[PDB]
């Protein structure tokens, strides 16, 4: 069992993207902190399926060392990576991601904007509540629906 971590860490540099994706997904289920830095390196992998799975794994770990690399992942060229980075940033709960997530509320992709708003609600704080009141007052569409729901439930 303790040797299963070192095997998957090695597979994060395998030539096959499918093999690298299997390793990142397995490291997220294990939950070992020795994979935090190897998974942070995987957020710049040439395969977007690997970067997304790496973000999901870092969210399961909860180590705050992945907060800043996940913040940079909010500008990834793939919307699937941005959305998964928002889920991980919300799962960790570090308020350093609040401001990047608020800027991500103006993303062109709609699923990214939903995950940016959903992550902000779970993180919480006064800075989050200010942005929720802004979207509840001047927002439109599904963004307004989430913001008004924040005021109905959270406070």
């Amino acid at each position: 069992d303790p040797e299963k971590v070192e095997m998957y860490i090695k597979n994060l540099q395998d030539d096959s993207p499918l093999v690298r994706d299997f390793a990142a997904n397995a490291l997220g289920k294990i939950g070992d902190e020795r994979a935090v830095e190897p998974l942070i390196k995987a957020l710049k992998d040439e395969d977007g399926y690997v970067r997304r799975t790496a973000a999901l794994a870092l969210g399961k770990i909860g180590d705050e060392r992945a907060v800043e690399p996940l913040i940079k992942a909010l500008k990834d060229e793939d919307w699937q990576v941005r959305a998964q980075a928002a889920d991980a940033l919300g799962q960790i709960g570090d308020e350093r991601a609040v401001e990047p997530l608020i800027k991500a509320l103006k993303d062109e992709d709609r699923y990214v904007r939903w995950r940016a708003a959903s992550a902000l609600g779970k993180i919480g704080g006064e800075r989050v509540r200010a942005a929720m009141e802004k979207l509840a007052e001047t927002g439109t569409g599904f963004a307004r629906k989430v913001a008004v729901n924040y005021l109905e439930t959270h406070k």
Partner: protein, 113 residues
Amino acid sequence: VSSFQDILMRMSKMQLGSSSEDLNGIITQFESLKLYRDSLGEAVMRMGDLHNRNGKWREQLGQKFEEIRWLIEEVRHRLKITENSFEQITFMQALQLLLEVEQEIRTFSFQLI
């Protein structure tokens, strides 16, 4: 017929205002298994003209057979218990896509072993 992100959004708006912790589990599996199917087909493309560890590699692929099967059963159960016409259509559009995903996961895994 239904766009993948469209089905994602319809299930996302269902998550708001509802207390269903099984819905995010279904949504995140729906996303992961769809994208895993895409990476399988690309792995077949990378082989070129079919140019594969028994056991380990075959099990990593075979474990995904049960994952896509149970997700279809999860969505079918949620479809069986909802009485909202919009939510029923959403679940059935998800079943249509997942039934294609299950077929292609098995065909691609057969080529990758």
